[PDB]
Amino acid sequence: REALVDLCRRRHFLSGTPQQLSTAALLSGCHARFGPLGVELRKNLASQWWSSMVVFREQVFAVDSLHQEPGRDSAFRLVSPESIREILQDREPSKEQLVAFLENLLKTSGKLRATLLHGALEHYVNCLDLVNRKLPFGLAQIGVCFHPVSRVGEKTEASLVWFTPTRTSSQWLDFWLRHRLLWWRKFAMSPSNFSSADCQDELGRKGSKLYYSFPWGKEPIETLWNLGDQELLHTYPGNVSTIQGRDGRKNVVPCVLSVSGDVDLGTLAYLYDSFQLAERKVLKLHPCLAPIKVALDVGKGPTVELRQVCQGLLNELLENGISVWPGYSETVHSSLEQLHSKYDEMSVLFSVLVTETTLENGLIQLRSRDTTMKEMMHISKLRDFLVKYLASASNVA
Amino acid sequence: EALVDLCRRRHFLSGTPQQLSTAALLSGCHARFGPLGVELRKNLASQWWSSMVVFREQVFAVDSLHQEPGSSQPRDSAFRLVSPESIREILQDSKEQLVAFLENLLKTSGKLRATLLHGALEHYVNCLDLVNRKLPFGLAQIGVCFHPVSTRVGEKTEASLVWFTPTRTSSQWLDFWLRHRLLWWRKFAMSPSNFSSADCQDELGRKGSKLYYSFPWGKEPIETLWNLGDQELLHTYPGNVSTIQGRDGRKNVVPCVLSVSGDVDLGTLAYLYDSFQLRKVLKLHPCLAPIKVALDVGKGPTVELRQVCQGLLNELLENGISVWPGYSETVHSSLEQLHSKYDEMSVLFSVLVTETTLENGLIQLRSRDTTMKEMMHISKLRDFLVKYLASASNVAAALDHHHHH
Ligand code: NA
Ligand code: NA
């Protein structure tokens, strides 16, 4: 078994049976891929996407849309089982009556969304109103999309749909291309492994794609398209006056750019990127992404007292939203060496050891993932040190 | 009618007039929320995530697919997923064969989930490993579930905690979580007594509780808590019961399963109704309000007041304070109109920047809550806002670690 995926499965970044840890299974989205460490890593990534694209941008608003669309091409259809049963009860068929049923399914049944684009379009007229028709602006959503494989794969997509006058659309597309690529790179240990290329679709529309170089090859993690206006006009038949936005004095139907990232594949990219057979394997996930910031353990000494102290430190750090692994809670004894190796595989940023010394003089032993050196710190400072350290890494962007 | 109409007008809600009836709002057949509403809901979901997961070292995140293995034997009402190809292929490409085809759909097609429970159950053994089998612990998830309407598909965002505990302590945990969840809804409410609970029991004598919000048309359940026992967990691992045991001290037991399940969309609607006060103002809790501050300009040099505002804007966003940039509009609106609008959008504070500000750095700050105005130095606003928001959330967090009985 490949080492990175093996470690990820052992440390609960990935879930699944061993056969589901193949490249094809991991890329298909046909099983829930992530275990608790992975779900947390992915939530951190999604939060960082939200910060960059919605929180820090006044012209981007959140949107939410259904998972199913009116029914498109290969998308699975939603069919009520009660309708099928109704049919299977009646003794006389036909072929006319059955074919009819099947025919009617193919034309009236809703279908699973393949992208988040249609949800943004359908909410455009309302956001336009909210912004008093001023262009440009965006609508953003993170949510699951469904993809026929070759079973239906599920992928978490982070979408920005940007509405701008056609005359600035090319400029906007290039701005998003650079910004999005820099966003992926800012969390990477090997930022050159995130690359980009131009592409064009079936219709000749221009776009770009962003890629991560996985061991087996490059996989697209984000696509950016200059869609023009057809999809928007397709959404609002007749009523054109209600979709025109202001470009200064001009009233115009805006051009639509779609900027869509694969949060799941992006999670897997950072897991591969983090792997350092440095020392023993370590996952050096970026501080803002690492699911566990600190681990707390008790050394040789008085069980119940040494744990009362860790509990207090845990509670303090959690009130401050710092994730903590309560190793002190464990029963089985494990060597310091074994602990550090595990924490390193889990991408834990700092490990803290509370000992009889601590009970005497209040000093803890603090070990860093990145340098791997141990320092003595007074328990009273730990919180401020950690709170400050994370804020520093998050400020870098 | 006034509330829904105001919400629709201010983009808390979305939809046509036929989508704004109480029936359509409850069905989940359309995406109910406009941008201010999606932000409100995101804030509510973040608060839930903080209280249930971030602050609880024995609760872990789980993610599970939206689709589940096809069954059909039972007759369940969950929508099935059918490949259009498959249908076309039998269609344009006799009776015996068609009936068999339909039978197959019912038996083998995947189905859309109706709850997040099975998701948690299926990841229980992994989490067991993660905690080296120590009970109790929980698996949490927020995600969309689907449900039959009337033949339409309703979508509801569910916030679920599935808690694994020894049977001997399961009753106490049920009571602990009930109090905890009820207090969680109430801490954001203008009228907390409109959030209540009721105890209940199921077909099999299993105990549960339900939490309700008293909407204008009656009480609606916004959360359910059930002491499920172990049946469902046991059914998830047939033939592996010996190795799904957790530790209760020194004893190995198959844990009892507590399922706590909250409706995030209905909860969002609850807070919209709860915030509505007569001027019409929505007094949403500071932690929930989608826009914390609006910045506007009064009398003065356009291109300079705007720079003061933008600077202010940049500073607040950088600090993650949501801000409405009213100064970028054209402004042919009165102060009273501007304020009435902000009150309806639940904006917590509005700030006015004028010539004077350029002379002495003073801005006029207006509170949604009292409508009182007040001069303040533009350099002190970021700090005022951050402290006001931290204070509100601290007050709200007062009892997140309170030991219920
Ligand atoms: Na924004
Ligand atoms: Na937790």
Side-chain angles (χ1 to χ4, degrees), chain A residues 1-90 92-278 280-397, chain B residues 1-150 152-405:
Chain A
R1 189 179 304 120
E2 202 277 318
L4 178 279
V5 171
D6 180 68
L7 176 163
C8 284
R9 185 58 182 91
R10 295 188 284 105
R11 299 315 179 183
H12 293 288
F13 276 97
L14 294 180
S15 52
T17 58
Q19 266 204 44
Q20 292 168 325
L21 303 172
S22 74
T23 300
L26 293 175
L27 290 174
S28 72
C30 292
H31 72 283
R33 293 167 275 213
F34 296 113
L37 270 66
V39 169
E40 289 283 355
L41 167 49
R42 183 232 255 160
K43 177 150 195 300
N44 288 344
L45 194 53
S47 297
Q48 286 296 321
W49 186 88
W50 204 263
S51 292
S52 293
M53 231 82 5
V54 190
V55 192
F56 302 139
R57 310 193 66 92
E58 67 289 340
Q59 286 163 333
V60 181
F61 300 90
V63 55
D64 166 65
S65 50
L66 300 171
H67 284 81
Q68 20 98 38
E69 299 161 355
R72 70 189 180 180
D73 219 289
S74 280
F76 281 43
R77 302 302 186 100
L78 302 208
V79 178
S80 90
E82 305 196 327
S83 88
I84 296 169
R85 280 205 275 288
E86 245 195 39
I87 274 290
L88 264 336
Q89 289 164 1
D90 317 308
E92 186 181 13
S94 276
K95 174 204 192 313
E96 306 181 355
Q97 294 177 4
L98 302 178
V99 164
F101 182 90
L102 294 173
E103 202 178 49
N104 192 2
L105 278 197
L106 214 51
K107 275 230 206 169
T108 45
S109 286
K111 67 205 174 13
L112 294 170
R113 74 186 176 196
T115 66
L116 300 176
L117 171 67
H118 293 109
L121 298 197
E122 283 189 49
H123 285 85
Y124 165 80
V125 156
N126 296 320
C127 204
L128 186 63
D129 181 66
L130 177 61
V131 296
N132 288 314
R133 300 196 319 108
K134 269 130 44 225
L135 299 170
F137 70 88
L139 290 177
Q141 181 168 195
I142 296 174
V144 167
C145 292
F146 307 85
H147 294 105
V149 72
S150 271
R151 320 148 177 201
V152 21
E154 290 187 24
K155 83 183 281 155
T156 296
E157 169 167 314
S159 165
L160 173 70
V161 178
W162 188 247
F163 302 89
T164 192
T166 296
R167 81 194 164 75
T168 57
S169 67
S170 286
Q171 289 168 62
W172 275 113
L173 185 74
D174 278 347
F175 168 83
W176 285 122
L177 164 56
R178 187 180 292 270
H179 195 256
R180 297 296 306 133
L181 181 63
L182 285 162
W183 181 84
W184 289 104
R185 285 184 171 191
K186 77 183 184 185
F187 302 114
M189 292 297 284
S190 298
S192 61
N193 284 334
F194 287 89
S195 68
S196 56
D198 290 324
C199 54
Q200 77 191 299
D201 73 9
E202 20 143 42
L203 307 181
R205 299 182 295 186
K206 293 205 189 152
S208 291
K209 295 184 170 170
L210 309 183
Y211 304 78
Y212 179 71
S213 304
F214 287 96
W216 65 93
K218 290 185 176 182
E219 300 288 351
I221 68 184
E222 178 137 15
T223 66
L224 296 89
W225 293 117
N226 184 341
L227 299 176
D229 62 28
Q230 309 210 6
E231 292 78 12
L232 198 56
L233 297 176
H234 185 77
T235 313
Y236 302 88
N239 266 347
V240 79
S241 189
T242 69
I243 56 166
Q244 298 169 307
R246 294 150 57 196
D247 174 16
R249 288 245 294 282
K250 294 164 192 159
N251 291 318
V252 300
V253 178
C255 179
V256 179
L257 308 180
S258 199
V259 179
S260 322
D262 184 340
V263 183
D264 298 332
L265 188 57
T267 297
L268 292 171
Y270 285 117
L271 284 166
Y272 276 94
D273 172 74
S274 76
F275 190 53
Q276 307 210 324
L277 284 93
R280 282 176 202 185
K281 307 160 214 178
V282 57
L283 296 191
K284 288 203 171 167
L285 291 170
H286 190 277
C288 307
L289 301 191
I292 301 170
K293 311 306 177 184
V294 178
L296 296 179
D297 284 284
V298 297
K300 295 172 188 184
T303 295
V304 177
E305 326 188 348
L306 282 184
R307 286 187 179 164
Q308 266 177 197
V309 170
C310 288
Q311 270 299 333
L313 186 46
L314 174 101
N315 294 347
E316 203 163 351
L317 296 167
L318 295 179
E319 285 212 0
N320 285 257
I322 290 179
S323 50
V324 179
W325 181 258
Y328 64 89
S329 276
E330 189 55 85
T331 268
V332 190
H333 185 54
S334 160
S335 85
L336 193 71
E337 307 83 73
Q338 291 179 304
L339 246 20
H340 294 165
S341 290
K342 178 177 73 182
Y343 291 159
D344 281 354
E345 293 192 335
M346 287 174 30
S347 200
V348 175
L349 297 182
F350 299 96
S351 54
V352 175
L353 188 75
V354 169
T355 67
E356 29 192 23
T357 300
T358 300
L359 290 189
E360 265 209 343
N361 83 350
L363 291 200
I364 62 188
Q365 170 172 22
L366 174 69
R367 172 203 189 255
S368 110
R369 185 189 63 190
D370 286 345
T371 66
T372 300
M373 258 148 304
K374 308 174 185 171
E375 168 75 61
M376 315 283 299
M377 243 197 72
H378 191 262
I379 198 165
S380 50
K381 275 182 156 181
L382 195 62
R383 173 199 205 153
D384 308 338
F385 166 73
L386 297 160
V387 152
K388 287 179 184 54
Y389 182 84
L390 299 168
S392 249
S394 51
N395 279 318
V396 178
Chain B
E1 195 60 22
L3 185 272
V4 163
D5 297 309
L6 171 165
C7 285
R8 180 60 180 81
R9 187 155 47 67
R10 297 312 172 180
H11 302 306
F12 275 98
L13 291 169
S14 182
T16 66
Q18 284 216 358
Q19 290 176 319
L20 296 164
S21 71
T22 300
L25 284 169
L26 298 178
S27 76
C29 256
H30 72 285
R32 282 165 281 211
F33 300 108
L36 274 68
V38 178
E39 272 295 328
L40 173 50
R41 186 172 69 175
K42 179 189 183 79
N43 287 340
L44 188 58
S46 299
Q47 291 292 329
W48 187 95
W49 198 260
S50 301
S51 297
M52 305 292 278
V53 188
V54 181
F55 302 154
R56 309 211 71 93
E57 69 271 19
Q58 292 158 312
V59 175
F60 301 82
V62 58
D63 165 82
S64 67
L65 299 179
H66 290 76
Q67 46 201 306
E68 299 168 328
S71 69
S72 83
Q73 297 178 0
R75 75 191 176 181
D76 71 334
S77 56
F79 278 88
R80 265 49 168 185
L81 294 185
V82 184
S83 157
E85 295 171 11
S86 93
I87 294 164
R88 266 180 252 268
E89 144 262 47
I90 77 148
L91 210 57
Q92 177 186 355
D93 283 338
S94 181
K95 176 215 174 165
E96 288 176 37
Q97 301 97 317
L98 298 174
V99 164
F101 182 78
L102 285 170
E103 274 191 34
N104 294 291
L105 286 189
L106 215 52
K107 245 176 190 180
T108 58
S109 292
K111 69 199 182 82
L112 285 179
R113 63 188 187 197
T115 65
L116 305 180
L117 175 65
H118 300 293
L121 293 178
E122 281 151 21
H123 296 261
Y124 165 80
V125 163
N126 286 329
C127 205
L128 215 44
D129 184 71
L130 193 61
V131 296
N132 205 9
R133 306 194 308 104
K134 288 189 294 308
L135 298 175
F137 68 94
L139 284 178
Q141 191 173 189
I142 297 170
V144 175
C145 302
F146 308 81
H147 66 260
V149 181
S150 269
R152 291 168 176 215
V153 35
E155 302 193 10
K156 102 158 176 171
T157 300
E158 171 162 313
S160 161
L161 169 71
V162 172
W163 187 246
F164 303 98
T165 194
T167 289
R168 79 171 159 90
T169 227
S170 68
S171 278
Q172 294 151 56
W173 278 117
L174 176 61
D175 290 333
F176 169 92
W177 285 114
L178 168 59
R179 192 71 350 191
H180 192 71
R181 300 295 306 132
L182 180 58
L183 289 191
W184 184 91
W185 294 103
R186 286 179 169 169
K187 73 193 181 174
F188 303 118
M190 293 291 310
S191 301
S193 58
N194 282 338
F195 289 94
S196 65
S197 59
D199 295 346
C200 57
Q201 68 176 39
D202 82 353
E203 335 185 333
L204 309 164
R206 306 189 288 182
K207 316 309 178 169
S209 299
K210 290 187 185 165
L211 305 184
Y212 297 91
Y213 178 72
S214 294
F215 286 103
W217 58 89
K219 293 183 173 179
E220 299 284 351
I222 62 183
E223 185 147 8
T224 70
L225 292 87
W226 284 109
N227 181 353
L228 299 168
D230 67 4
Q231 284 164 242
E232 293 91 347
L233 182 50
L234 290 168
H235 178 108
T236 310
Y237 302 90
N240 274 174
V241 169
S242 275
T243 52
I244 59 162
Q245 284 163 31
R247 303 150 60 189
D248 174 18
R250 51 146 61 159
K251 285 179 288 182
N252 289 327
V253 291
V254 167
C256 179
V257 179
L258 304 188
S259 179
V260 177
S261 165
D263 186 333
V264 184
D265 296 330
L266 195 46
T268 294
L269 286 176
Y271 287 115
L272 292 168
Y273 280 97
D274 169 87
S275 72
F276 181 49
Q277 302 223 329
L278 276 149
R279 74 179 171 139
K280 307 162 85 195
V281 55
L282 295 190
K283 303 199 171 176
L284 288 165
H285 190 279
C287 296
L288 296 187
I291 298 167
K292 307 314 180 186
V293 70
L295 308 177
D296 283 283
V297 295
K299 300 285 68 174
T302 295
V303 181
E304 309 172 357
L305 294 178
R306 285 196 220 290
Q307 301 174 338
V308 169
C309 288
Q310 264 289 331
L312 208 40
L313 175 72
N314 290 341
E315 191 189 355
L316 298 167
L317 284 186
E318 281 175 34
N319 287 240
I321 285 167
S322 51
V323 171
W324 179 260
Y327 64 86
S328 322
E329 204 131 281
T330 198
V331 305
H332 285 293
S333 90
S334 180
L335 217 68
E336 326 75 56
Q337 297 163 355
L338 204 52
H339 291 161
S340 86
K341 175 175 87 187
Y342 294 153
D343 288 350
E344 291 185 345
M345 289 168 73
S346 197
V347 175
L348 299 179
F349 294 96
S350 43
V351 171
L352 190 73
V353 170
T354 80
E355 274 186 341
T356 323
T357 299
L358 292 177
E359 289 179 359
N360 69 2
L362 295 188
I363 56 169
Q364 176 199 272
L365 179 55
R366 171 181 185 282
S367 152
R368 175 190 73 190
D369 283 359
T370 63
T371 70
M372 301 300 208
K373 297 185 181 197
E374 144 94 353
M375 298 306 271
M376 175 210 250
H377 195 273
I378 202 174
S379 61
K380 290 173 188 154
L381 187 66
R382 171 175 160 178
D383 287 331
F384 168 81
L385 293 170
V386 169
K387 283 194 271 176
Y388 181 93
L389 295 169
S391 185
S393 62
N394 280 331
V395 165
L399 302 179
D400 239 317
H401 286 113
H402 184 84
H403 198 165
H404 304 284
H405 337 296

